[PDB]
Design a protein around this ligand. Structure first.
Ligand SMILES: Nc1ncnc2c1ncn2[C@@H]1O[C@H](COP(=O)(O)OC(=O)CCC(=O)c2ccccc2C(=O)O)[C@@H](O)[C@H]1O
Ligand SMILES: [N]C1=N[C]=NC2=C1N=[C]N2[C]1O[C]([C]OP([O])(=O)/O=C(\[O])[C][C]C(=O)C2=C(C([O])=O)[C]=[C][C]=[C]2)[C]([O])[C]1[O]
Ligand code: CL
Ligand code: CL
Ligand code: CL
Ligand code: CL
Ligand code: MG
Lengths: 484, 380
């Protein structure tokens, strides 16, 4: 079991002089990281931040933010990670809903807009203060909520995912049983730390005793220099980052032994060149609810199983279900997951919890299927499913064939009411060059069943997205002009 | 509170990975699961039901590995019996453990146990046809997986109840300590009824790692097996380490870790650190389901003859007269962690005497230096 020694505390005790964090070319050892985090904890403690409270963190990727997360752990305070791209309204909603009483942030955000709800605290000025030394929380309770992270689904109001210390621990372990651990391993994070893809590395770090090379943002050149300067072996990335890394290099940096690719679907041709040029890409499937990846695939299988998300990590389980009955191979249904990395429950979401759980299994809201060998193929969100005359239209499928076209930069497919059929597919595009709708229909013709092809076409400057750049399909109708 | 069966899931993930090398045949994990499922079905035919306790009296064989897993797949507590013990020593443990069955073979005399347990000849058992059964696809973390008896003086042997959870966290903690590599293969010439050997079987299904298995230790045999199968991890006691040093000058380049367990010695370590042998000194016991403290080779000159530091998730402290001991101040070593045993089987007195607030009094003595390294002395 029910408790473990604090990960950072014990890691500092075991290997004090291992590098914990590399940011901006400055280095921080685990002993230093613990000292910093303990110091920040004591400084927070002087602001009436008591054990059992809830603190929200609104920060860009800095070394200070790493301190803040650990400081909350050492104080025994639930850390709420806030997406920095949220509107003032969205931030306030999550602040209130989470029951945060504090907001750790800096001068780059308008802290004054939230004083009326929570006690705001500037990180840089907090560290300039003096404080009475406190005795930290030396033990993490495995079933205690460590961090609260909000879902970014395009359906309904965002839910707070309760991630336990146990969840994070088993995420780190399962991943390591899958990827292996060397003493020379170093992980580069250019993804935000308020997202689970970035946050989880901080826990991998102290549990493995592994150095995290931290970047505030992703630039291909800064990353490539960083990889070579620090002998980076592990890197986490989304599709666009991987695509950009291929444009700027012929060969993959020898130092890199793993590229954990997640967050969504990757186009087959992109993966095919990674195979070609020796990029060790690990396709993965996971969510905030699962504390990161829960299903991963090995470069050995990328061609063989190109479109596949892989198999469950050790200790983890997946199944495909439809109307309560388990699906046959290739039979489409809802992806359900299970394992010690799966969240406790959504915070303060009675309806969502009851509905999303069935006998210890989590309904992910994702549609997909398994092949004969059990490899997972993710399809699309169920909520975004389009029915055209009894037939199922997965927007991600049509968006993919549209995206593959050169003149098409962004594609969005939505279900519009039709008389002849239940709904009809509509394509909302952003374009690099102009494309004739004839050449476009003649492009979808060779790649899609007739009913899948978008009846009409629209053109825009941008597509409706939330703070996670996820496409808001229900808001597509409408923003702008459409030609034929 | 539960994980899918390690062997079953491992077989699902990487079916074709070698699970076992029992020279010189090979068993894939898919094969290991198939063999272990068959033996389970054959045992059920002998009225071996879930919740029962079965004793295993075998020496290092592929069939012994199947037997352990067959118990897990059946939901049967496995008692691993030391073959070097006398007959009355095993009879005591059979009575004590509450075993209903004894799995063994021709090398041991059945009907020298039949008057106390129902005996089954594993080799005979395998030849028999049996109906299919639905295996126990889940391991409960808090349920007793194996029962191993304390082979030590100062009292009648106690049965250590080792949970599936204990074994898992054992395997994980050592991984966090030693690291896992795709090309890793562990060599076990130690007896499988001792936790030093048994734990490797669990590392195998959890890591997805090949175990090269020997019956006994013979230095020439081990070195040939090391190079033929490219062993990278080796478990050994000092007698084995002194032998391998007294045979060849150069350490096989394939080996990356030599996990030394049991007692000390000090002059022998220098002969390894200078000869290129990556020896890892460790402090562990049946109670802690293997090692709980290991010592990295890089800090062996500075740490002299130290046990090392606790594995991740694990804790050690030194106590005397109920109070904590300062650095270098002697006292009893006390361990704590998810790899530490729940309780002795049917030993209420020993349980209360040995456990104080989730801490296990080891019955051993030692201290910690300024840098927190464990230096171990002796038993009471
Ligand atoms: N592989 C794949 N295919 C298709 N759809 C996919 C997908 N992976 C995720 N998804 C969809 O995104 C939803 C989950 O999004 P979030 O809840 O906000 O969190 C994540 O995306 C987890 C990804 C992640 O953690 C990551 C990202 C980048 C590099 C590494 C890692 C990592 O696992 O550590 C979900 O609903 C699903 O439909
Ligand atoms: N190191 C040391 N030192 C001193 N002492 C000791 C040590 N170690 C141990 N020790 C002792 O002994 C005992 C215990 O015993 P048992 O329980 O019976 O068993 C054991 O030991 C275990 C070990 C192991 O496991 C091994 C390994 C691992 O870890 O894995 C490897 C190899 C070998 C072995 C106690 O009591 C103490 O005291
Ligand atoms: Cl809102
Ligand atoms: Cl390591
Ligand atoms: Cl459906
Ligand atoms: Cl252990
Ligand atoms: Mg498992």
């Amino acid at each position: 079991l029910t408790e473990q020694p604090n990960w950072l505390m014990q890691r500092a005790q075991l290997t004090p002089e291992r590098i914990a964090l590399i940011y901006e070319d400055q280095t921080v050892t685990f002993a230093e990281l613990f000292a910093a985090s303990k110091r920040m904890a004591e400084q927070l403690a002087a602001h009436s931040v008591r054990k059992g409270d809830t603190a929200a963190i609104l920060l860009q990727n800095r070394a200070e933010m790493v301190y803040a997360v650990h400081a909350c752990f050492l104080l025994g305070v639930k850390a709420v990670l806030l997406n920095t791209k949220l509107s003032t309204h969205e931030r306030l909603f999550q602040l209130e809903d989470s029951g945060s009483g504090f907001l750790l942030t800096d001068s780059s955000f308008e802290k004054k807009e939230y004083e009326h709800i929570v006690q705001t605290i500037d990180v840089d000025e907090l560290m300039k203060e003096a404080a009475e030394e406190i005795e930290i929380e030396a033990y993490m309770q495995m079933d205690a909520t460590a961090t609260l992270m909000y879902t970014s689904g395009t359906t309904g109001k965002p839910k707070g995912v309760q991630q336990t210390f146990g969840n994070h621990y088993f995420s780190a372990v399962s991943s390591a049983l899958n990827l292996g651990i060397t003493e020379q391993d170093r992980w580069l994070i250019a993804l935000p730390l308020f997202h689970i893809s970035g946050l989880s590395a901080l826990f991998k770090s102290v549990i493995y005793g592994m150095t995290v090379v931290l970047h505030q943002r992703f630039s291909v050149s800064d990353v490539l220099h960083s990889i070579n300067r620090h002998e980076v072996t592990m890197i986490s990335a989304v599709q666009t980052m991987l695509a950009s890394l291929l444009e700027e290099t012929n060969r993959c940096p020898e130092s890199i032994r793993c590229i954990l690719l997640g967050g969504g679907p990757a186009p087959l041709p992109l993966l095919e060149e990674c195979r070609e040029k020796g990029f060790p890409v690990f396709q993965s499937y996971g969510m905030t609810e699962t504390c990161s990846q829960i299903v991963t695939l090995s470069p050995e299988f990328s061609m063989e199983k190109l479109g596949s998300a892989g198999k469950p990590l050790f200790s983890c389980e997946i199944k495909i279900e439809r109307d309560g009955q388990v699906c046959e191979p290739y039979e489409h249904g809802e992806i359900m997951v299970k394992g010690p990395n799966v969240m406790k429950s959504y915070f303060n979401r009675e309806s969502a919890n009851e509905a999303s759980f069935q006998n210890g299994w989590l309904k992910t809201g994702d549609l997909g299927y398994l092949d004969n060998e059990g490899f997972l193929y993710v399809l699309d969100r169920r909520s975004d499913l389009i029915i055209s005359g009894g037939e199922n239209i997965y927007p991600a499928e049509v968006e993919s064939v549209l995206l593959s076209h050169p003149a098409v930069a962004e594609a969005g497919v939505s279900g519009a009411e039709d008389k002849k059929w239940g709904k009809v597919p509509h394509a909302y595009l952003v374009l690099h060059k102009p494309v004739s709708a004839g050449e476009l229909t003649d492009y979808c013709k060779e790649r899609l069943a007739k009913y899948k092809i978008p009846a009409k076409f629209f053109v825009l400057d941008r597509l409706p997205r939330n703070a996670s750049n996820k496409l808001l399909r229900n808001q597509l109708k409408d923003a702008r002009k459409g030609e034929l």
